[PDB]
Amino acid sequence: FLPLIGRVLSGIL
């Protein structure tokens, strides 16, 4: 899986 998909939620702001 991609650990960026679950972070993009907050990483995208």
Three-state secondary structure call for residue 2: coil
Q: Which of the 8 DSSP states describes residue 1?
A: -
- 3: its two tokens: 């650990």
- Cα separation, 9 vs 13, in Å, equals 7
Q: Which method was it determined by?
A: NMR
Q: Are residues 4 and 11 in contact, defined by beta-carbon separation less than 8 angstroms?
A: yes
Closest to 12 measured CA to CA, from 3, 1, 2, 4: 4
**What's the length of the chain?**
13
Q: Is the dihedral of CA 8, 3, 6, 1 positive or negative?
A: positive
Strands (E), 1-13: none
- Cα separation, 7 vs 10, in Å, equals 6
Q: Which residues, in sequence order, are CB contacts of 11 under 8 Å at separation 6+? A: 4
